[PDB]
């Protein structure tokens, strides 16, 4: 079976779990028990199921040089998709929550959960708690006896913790951080002192790669019982830097790329995000194009995000992406080295994560 | 050591415990600490502690007669503060997101969190969230090595998703369940079919009692080795009949208790909500009474919620709530004694919870 097709059926399978468990032991009704299942479908499916993909990628990176019966195999690969599917649960909690808090209005070419006419914001705040709360049920109910259980336990929420404290970076990054205070309104930054990469870095390793690069490829070693053919830290390294590189070309898309590839209307400008474009644009600007983008940046304006997009295009922030491109692509096929020492086969995972972002 | 001043100790000790591992592990600057610091207080704290505190209560009964070494002693009384707090802060969570959701205006007398001027929503949901990882954070630190660390977790997210099962059966309760559809806009009940007993102790079974006290009194028997001192089955039912009166009691209160006792001006009747007052009301009014009720109930409108509260107060329901209390006294009367059969501290330790539930 192609993993696809693996993965795919486990969603039915664990989707079926859920709402059977919810009429048998939750007294749930069937009426809201449809809603719950078109809520699944549609804040868990319809991308590319990357991350939860990872997972089984991995895990059949080591059936490959691992003695099993075939029975263990096939355990192996449903405990891959199951976690696989908790990381898109994950995901769906987040892209819930965060639309909400947000405003957004689309997202994948749809509108945001919480503006389907049935559910408005009172419901989807807890729909996206319910979401998270299923990748729990996940867990207990398929790895009840498994040995890496309490470690996935463990990793999983470490993740969530990092990606709740990652997107409080990134809703106050437009602020000053000496001026944080839950009495006093959040003025917008006037000097931009903290758009620098290194904070830019914080807000994505945090927000992004812990999620979307790190735990899919330890989860992966977790249902293979594989973690000790790696450098657990050379994974953290390579992860972070795949998973900056990412945003960085998220980041890009939403100023550049037409609303219907993206599938939004890109706002990071008028929402005043710490974006790569933002920083690496003040790290070359001169005084006056510094003083043109404050008065600019953060306004909802058609007018004044324009000039913000044409101080981006004059400043040839390309050269500086062809560079930083390059850059990672050193530093990615180094670590790619270092993790060969111990495993090839996870190696080659990691090369096939990286060869998946980078070509997109 | 009094119980309430090692139960605030160890808030003071876990906040420093999570602060300090912001800075050391996750990168945090000291004034978005102090903003998490500041979320932390105003959400956990200024309410009477009872959940927390019954964790505590139930360790010290069986401390009482039970042998151990002092620093044993010390060291259940510890973790039954830090699964208290667990406990108080996935309350936090639920409140912060439940007055999100509901645009409530007030909680305990003060502005509910989302509304203090330099939090909005945008960062409320979010802090929502981090209140709720913070319990996982807590338990895995504490716990590491405990015996009762995986009933305990499992446990603490079957809680947590019952509740957030609850939320749903709350927010959806005026709502016709065969109407129930994210693609269109949901009416409100005409017929009110779906006020009902059975219906409303759903609702409360899963949005209160769980975490209320079904979660303190067996976290208690986790933290203390003593589950089998219990025959499970009767502590779920003591809990679902406490925790049902208890939300019988708020349910009276939220329509007549004057707002500075309750730390709010209740909506209930303007929210159309599945009360119990509603139900019961229902359940004796004639066809003139069930018509008045039906063109008034659920409307802003001051006069309409005027007409409802002269309804309940004509129908006379102090003598529903009256007989109510009779056959809950009876009933839990009856299980405390069917609890004696196997722990007689037990049984007492749910003797106090009902008898701090009945006064107040
Ligand atoms: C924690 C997260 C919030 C949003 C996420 C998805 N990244 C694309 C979005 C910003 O459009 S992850
Ligand atoms: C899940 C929960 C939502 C709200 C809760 C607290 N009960 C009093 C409130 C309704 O005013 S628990
Ligand atoms: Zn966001
Ligand atoms: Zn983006
Ligand atoms: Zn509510
Ligand atoms: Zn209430």
Redesign the pocket.
């Known amino acids: 079976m192609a993993s696809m097709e693996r993965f795919l059926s486990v969603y039915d399978e664990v989707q079926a779990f859920l709402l059977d468990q919810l009429q048998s032991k939750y007294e749930i009704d069937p009426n809201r028990a449809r809603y719950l299942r078109i809520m699944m479908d549609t804040t868990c499916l319809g991308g590319k199921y990357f991350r939860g993909m990872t997972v089984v990628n991995v895990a059949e990176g080591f059936l490959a040089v691992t003695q099993h019966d075939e029975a263990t195999k096939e355990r192996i690969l449903h405990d891959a998709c199951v976690g696989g599917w908790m990381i898109e649960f994950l ?1 769906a909690h ?2 819930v ?3 909400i808090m ?1 405003g ?1 209005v689309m ?1 994948r070419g749809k509108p945001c959960w919480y503006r389907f006419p049935g559910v408005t914001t009172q419901c989807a705040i807890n729909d996206g708690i319910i979401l998270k709360s299923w990748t729990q049920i996940m867990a207990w109910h398929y790895f009840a006896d498994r040995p890496f259980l309490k470690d996935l336990l463990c990793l999983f929420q470490k993740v969530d913790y990092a ?2 404290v ?2 409080m970076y ?1 809703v106050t990054s437009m602020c000053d951080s000496n001026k944080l205070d839950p009495e006093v309104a959040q003025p917008m930054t006037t000097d931009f002192a903290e758009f620098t990469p290194a904070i830019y870095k914080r807000i994505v390793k945090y ?2 790669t812990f ?2 690069y790190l735990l899919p490829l330890v989860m992966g070693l977790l249902v293979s019982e594989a973690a000790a053919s790696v450098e657990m830290n050379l994974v953290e390294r390579v992860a972070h830097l795949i998973g900056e590189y990412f ?1 960085v070309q ?1 980041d890009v898309m ?1 100023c550049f790329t037409p609303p219907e590839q993206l599938g ?1 209307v890109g706002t990071d400008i008028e929402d005043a995000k710490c974006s790569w474009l933002a920083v690496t644009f003040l790290g070359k600007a001169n005084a006056a194009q510094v003083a043109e983008f404050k008065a600019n940046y953060g306004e909802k304006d058609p007018a004044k995000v324009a000039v913000v997009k044409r101080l981006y295009s004059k400043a040839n922030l390309q050269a500086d992406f062809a560079a930083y491109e390059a850059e990672v692509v050193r530093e990615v096929e180094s670590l790619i080295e270092q993790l060969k020492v111990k495993s090839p086969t996870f190696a080659e995972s990691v090369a096939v994560v990286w060869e998946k972002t980078h070509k997109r």
């Open positions: 995901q987040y892209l929550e965060d639309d947000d957004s997202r990606t709740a990652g997107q990134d927000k992004t999620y979307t945003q998220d939403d939004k």
